[PDB]
Amino acid sequence: AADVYVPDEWEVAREKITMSRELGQGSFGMVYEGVAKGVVKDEPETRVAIKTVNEAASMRERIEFLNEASVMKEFNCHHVVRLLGVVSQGQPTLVIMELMTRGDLKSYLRSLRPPPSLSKMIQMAGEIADGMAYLNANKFVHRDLAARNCMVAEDFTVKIGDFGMTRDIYETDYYRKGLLPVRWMSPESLKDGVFTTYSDVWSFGVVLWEIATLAEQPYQGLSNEQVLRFVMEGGLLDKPDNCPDMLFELMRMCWQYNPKMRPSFLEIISSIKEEMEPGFREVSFYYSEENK
Ligand SMILES: N#Cc1ccc2[nH]cc(CCCCN3CCC(NC(=O)c4cccc5c(C#N)c[nH]c45)CC3)c2c1
Ligand SMILES: N#Cc1ccc2[nH]cc(CCCCN3CCC(NC(=O)c4cccc5c(C#N)c[nH]c45)CC3)c2c1
Numbered sequence: 232a233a234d235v236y237v238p239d240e241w242e243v244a245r246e247k248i249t250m251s252r253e254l255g256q257g258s259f260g261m262v263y264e265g266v267a268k269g270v271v272k273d274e275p276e277t278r279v280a281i282k283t284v285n286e287a288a289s290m291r292e293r294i295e296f297l298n299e300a301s302v303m304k305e306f307n308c309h310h311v312v313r314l315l316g317v318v319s320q321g322q323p324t325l326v327i328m329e330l331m332t333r334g335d336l337k338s339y340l341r342s343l344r345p346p347p348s349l350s351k352m353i354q355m356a357g358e359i360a361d362g363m364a365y366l367n368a369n370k371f372v373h374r375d376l377a378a379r380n381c382m383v384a385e386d387f388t389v390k391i392g393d394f395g396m397t398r399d400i401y402e403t404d405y406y407r408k409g410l411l412p413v414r415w416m417s418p419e420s421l422k423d424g425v426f427t428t429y430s431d432v433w434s435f436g437v438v439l440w441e442i443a444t445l446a447e448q449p450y451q452g453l454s455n456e457q458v459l460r461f462v463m464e465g466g467l468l469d470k471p472d473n474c475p476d477m478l479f480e481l482m483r484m485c486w487q488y489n490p491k492m493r494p495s496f497l498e499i500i501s502s503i504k505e506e507m508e509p510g511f512r513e514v515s516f517y518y519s520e521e522n523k
Contacts, residue, residue, distance in 0.1 A: 232298075233294065233298075234294065235294070236293075236294060236297040236298070236301070236319050238319045238320060241300075241314070241317045242316070242317055242318065242319065243270065243316035243317065243318055243325075243327060244318075245320070245321065247267060247268040247269060248265060248266075248267050248279075248281065248325065248327065249266050249267075250263040250264070250265040250281055251263070251265050251266070254280060255394075256399045257282050257394035257395045257398070257399075258394070258395020258396070258397050258398050259288060259296045260282070260283040260285035261285070262280060262281065262282050262283070262394045263281045263283070264278070264279075264280060264281070264330065265280075265281050266279065267279045267281075267316060267327050270315040270316050270327060277315070278330045279315060279327050279328065279329070280327075280328045280329070280330045280394070281325055281326070281328075282296075282325065282326040282328065283324065284296050284323055284324035284325075286323065293324050296324060296326070297317070297324065297326075299326075300314060300317050300326045302371075305369065306365075306366070306369065306371075308361075308362055308516055309361075309515070310358050310365065310388075310389075310390050310514075310516070311362045311365060311366065311390055311392065312328055312329050312331060312382055312390050312391065312392025313328065314326070314327075315327040315328060315329060328392070329390075331382035331383060331384050332383075332384065332385040333383035333387070334382065335378070335379050335380070335382055335393065335396075336355075336378040336381040336382065336383055336389060336441075337378040337379040337401060337441065338379075339383050340378060340441065340442065340446040341445060341446050343445055344445050346445070347442070349475045349478070350506070352442050352443065352475070352478060353503055353506045353507070355389045356439060356442070356478075356481070356499075356503065357500060357503055357504070357506075357507045357511060357515075358388060358389045358390070359381055359391065359435065360496045361496075361500060361515045361516050361517055362390060362391040362516075363376065363431060363496045364495075364496035364497050364500060364516050364517060364522075365516040365521075366391065367431065367495075367496055368516070368521075368522070372426050372427060372428060372430075373426075373431050373434070374426040374430075375393075375412050375415070375434075376391075376431050376434035377396075377415050377437070378441040378446055379393070379396045379401045380392070380396060381438070397410050406455040411424075412434075413455050413458050413459060414437070414448070414449040414455075414458055415433075415434045415437045416430065416433070416434070416462070417429065417433035417462075418462050418488060419490055421459050421463050422463060427490065428495070428496075429491070430490065431496075432485050432493045432494065432495070432496065432499070433485055433486060433490075433493070435485055435499070436481070436482045436483075436486045437468070437485075439478055439482050439485070440482055442478075443474045443479075444471045447471075449468055465488055467483075467486055468482070468486075481499070481502070485499075497517065497522070500515075500517045
């Protein structure tokens with residue numbers, strides 16, 4: 232399982248993939264926009280994102296890259312970016328993904344700085360929580376939930392997804408005392424380095440705070456070590472200027488010191504479902520037959 236990737240029904244002929252332009256450096260190599268033939272039912276061609284493994288990468292790194300794709304083969308959720316294919320024969324190694332035309336949510340929020348309505352903010356919150364509920368139900372703990380690791384579609388739908396954020400402009404969101412997203416981590420994760428569904432919920436509260444501040448750096452002014460201490464000693468982020476009270480109260484629930492006191496993602500959605508737009512009932516994990 233380690234050491235080898237076996238090409239399968241996800242393998243795409245490299246001749247069916249064309250790359251048009253760069254999207255940015257991912258954690259294993261450059262990511263491109265392009266077009267893939269035959270990857271979506273009833274579409275002769277589909278616009279896609281294309282992750283690559285850099286030429287200088289090691290044998291082991293190629294496998295890690297491929298195992299990350301392998302884990303997503305199981306998933307099919309409206310609120311999680313979809314795997315579409317793999318090219319593991321010859322070079323370069325490629326992974327083909329659903330294209331999110333408006334990019335990552337951190338960048339998007341920052342672009343709005345010289346404001347999104349409460350209804351808009353709630354829609355984003357529910358979409359993110361729904362994708363996370365789906366993943367957690369399928370025994371997937373994310374470990375790096377953050378606005379930079381959510382993506383925005385042409386119609387503004389937010390989905391869980393990323394190309395690896397440790398090596399580009401948000402590299403300073405990680406601390407290497409392995410790389411740890413310390414400003415997004417629960418007190419218990421900061422202490423013992425274990426991640427759980429409960430710590431994903433902590434991180435979700437930070438994502439709400441990002442939405443409410445147009446992606447300020449959490450704990451701005453504190454160094455990484457000062458953040459570790461602050462959070463482990465029971466400190467919290469301040470209520471953002473002009474923040475709707477209902478959003479801050481949700482943050483506070485996510486930031487219970489005791490992980491067992493926090494809501495689950497399903498409980499979070501239950502608390503805001505009345506404010507979700509028409510359509511959510513039809514596409515969500517929460518309302519689906521799978522949620523049981
Ligand atoms: N290919 C592909 C592909 C296709 C469709 C997709 N839709 C959504 C995603 C991204 C899902 C999130 C995956 N990421 C979650 C954090 C993981 N982090 C680690 O695996 C990890 C590795 C080493 C040390 C630590 C650590 C510590 N200390 C905490 N996490 C890690 C990296 C992958 C996605 C990816
Ligand atoms: N920062 C920021 C920011 C900036 C601009 C934004 N505009 C909208 C949002 C909120 C995110 C929610 C996006 N939503 C837009 C309508 C979509 N709904 C539909 O697309 C739809 C809903 C119901 C039936 C059908 C249908 C049928 N049959 C075809 N489409 C639909 C669902 C996602 C938003 C957030």
